[PDB]
Design a protein around this ligand. Sequence first.
Ligand code: CL
Length: 283
Amino acid sequence: IPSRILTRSQLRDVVASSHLLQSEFMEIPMNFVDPKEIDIPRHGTKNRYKTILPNPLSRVCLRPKNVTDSLSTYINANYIRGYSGKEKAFIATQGPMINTVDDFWQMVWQEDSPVIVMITKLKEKNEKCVLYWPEKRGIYGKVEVLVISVNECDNYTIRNLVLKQGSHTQHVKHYWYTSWPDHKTPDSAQPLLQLMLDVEEDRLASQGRGPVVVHCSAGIGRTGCFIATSIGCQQLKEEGVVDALSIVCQLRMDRGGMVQTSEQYEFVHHALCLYESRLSAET
Ligand SMILES: [Cl-]
């Protein structure tokens, strides 16, 4: 409905057009939820930022057994639609807090997520996220996580996890991208593209499985960047064009505030541009 479809040429020009991207970004409403829309007493206790809340229509509802309260189903996390409106392509969530780590893993388990993408240091001046995974093994509520391997890459490290409950096992790839500046976007999109492409290969290898879980700290800025880029590169690949405006608007339909700043919005364009240079000539 808010639309601005860009051809590959158009996309390549708009990178050197920050002025226009700022006002284009500024024309997209944040879609932050009214606190009164959420009717879950004490949901605040499970939120890292008190005004960054999950839109209720798309919130990830934990499925614990033998509790009667709505708070027991609450996690600050939303399902995010993918390319073509693909339901549950992603979950955008906040950095787990000390009191929400078991909740987090309940979500990863119950949704059958194959990949976690973590785009935050634990501390960046402030505490941004808690250490929620073990060195070898840890038990998080009903979910046991085992570290099978660690893989070091240029721009991120991977833990290869399995989650276990009883007889059941689920593999989870956990990516940790730590080099994103406190308040600036990275100077190069290559590292984030590399991550996007590795994760894209994991999704193709994970047919029928659940959403890729993406988070940073509030789970909208960097997380929105990663997801907007993932989908927009997918539109670039399939259609030869990209509607980054539309993408960000739909993302905000899923979770208020996705792609938080205009600098992030521009950075998504840098990434989409970088992706485009690797595509086969247009036709
Ligand atoms: Cl343990």
